[PDB]
């Protein structure tokens, strides 16, 4: 028995299939992420990804920022910092789309995400989801029972 | 002390000038690369052949001389 094999049985494409790459748990988990929903519209996948990432970045800004020791100001400052990072990443995503876009089998249609228009809808979805996730992070620091 | 440091300054001036002047006069060619003018002022090398030719261009003589100029002004 051998658990490492050439990628799709092809020994000459520079990749190997290992339990890390191709366990049913890993391949099933990765397939259900919003990045890998090829038929789903790039705007809504951008909304989901932006919600996740804008929510998560507020934490380090809240707990470790320069105003972390000022009660009340710490949360608002951390969330404004997270919003600034979300906006900067939205600009980065937008200029990526304008420059990057000037077959695939398992036959598959290519991702609408990997086009100029699809990436721009993805950038809009990222911005909306990111600002919403930052606002929800602030709401959670104002409402969670065991938050400190 | 002024004597010793002035002779250090003379060493720096003469060595920086040596690197720069050898770069300018060998810019068109040398025995190691007799057709150097055909390759221009700045080029990486002429490869590992003929013993190896790293930093053979006149530009590289400028690059080496900047170190000596900084040493001298220091």
């Amino acid at each position: 028995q051998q658990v490492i094999q050439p990628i799709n049985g092809d020994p000459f494409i520079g990749m190997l299939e290992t339990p890390v790459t191709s366990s049913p748990l890993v391949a099933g988990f990765l397939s259900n992420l919003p990045a890998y929903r090829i038929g789903v519209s790039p705007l809504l996948r951008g909304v989901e990804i932006g919600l996740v990432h804008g929510f998560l970045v507020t934490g380090p800004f809240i707990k470790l920022g320069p105003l972390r020791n000022i009660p009340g100001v710490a949360e608002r400052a951390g969330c404004l910092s997270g919003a600034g990072l979300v906006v900067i990443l939205a600009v980065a995503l937008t200029i990526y789309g304008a420059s990057a876009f000037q077959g695939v089998k398992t036959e598959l249609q290519r991702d609408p995400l990997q086009t100029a228009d699809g990436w721009q809808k993805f950038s809009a979805g990222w911005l909306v989801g990111g600002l919403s996730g930052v606002a929800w992070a602030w709401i959670l620091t104002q409402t969670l029972p065991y938050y400190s | 002390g002024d004597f010793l440091v002035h002779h250090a300054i003379a060493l720096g001036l003469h060595t920086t000038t040596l690197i720069l002047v050898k770069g300018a006069l060998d810019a068109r060619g040398s025995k190691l690369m007799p057709d150097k003018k055909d390759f221009g002022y700045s080029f990486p090398c002429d490869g590992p052949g003929r013993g190896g030719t790293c930093d053979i261009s006149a530009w590289d003589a400028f690059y080496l001389a900047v170190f000596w100029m900084l040493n001298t002004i220091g």
Binding site: - | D26, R28, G29, S30, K31, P34
Partner: protein, 163 residues
């Protein structure tokens, strides 16, 4: 240069006294007749002799209390400082011309051998010793080569890069 003779310099005398005092302070931790005591006393004797000799040579001393050398050949000859730089210049130039002439003679002699490169890393030691002894008369031979025209190779026989 506004300097003072070291034999009448107060800084020179203070330096001698201070160096002797430091060596003597080191001395009073050893028994007499021990090896450290004898070594320290020998160093003290050498220090006293050195300061006396530097004073007696007519060396000039600065405000630092240290000897300063005079190297202009005019100032050295008229004011008795030729032993500082000028006579060492003559001595060095004689030995250096000796070394260079011996090396040139050995290289020229090796050029006529069937394997000239062999004598460059396997030395013909009797020939090298003979040539080294003959280097004492280098200025005469070198001046004759200069006037005769055999010291220098002609420019038409020397490789040059394209200009």
């Amino acid at each position: 240069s506004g300097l003072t003779p070291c034999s009448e310099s107060k800084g020179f005398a203070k330096r001698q006294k201070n160096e002797i005092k430091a060596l003597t302070k080191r001395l009073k931790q050893y028994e007499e007749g021990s090896a450290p005591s004898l070594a320290l006393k020998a160093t003290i004797e050498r220090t006293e002799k050195r300061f006396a000799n530097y004073g007696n040579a007519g060396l000039l001393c600065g405000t630092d209390g240290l000897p300063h050398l005079i190297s202009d050949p005019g100032l050295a000859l008229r004011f008795g400082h030729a032993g500082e730089t000028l006579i060492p210049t003559v001595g060095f130039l004689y030995i250096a011309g000796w070394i260079g002439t011996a090396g040139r003679d050995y290289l020229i002699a090796s050029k006529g051998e069937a394997k000239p490169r062999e004598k460059e890393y396997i030395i013909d030691v009797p020939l090298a010793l003979k040539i080294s002894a003959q280097g004492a008369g280098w200025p005469f031979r070198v001046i004759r080569e200069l006037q005769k025209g055999t010291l220098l190779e002609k420019d038409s026989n020397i490789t040059v890069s394209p200009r």
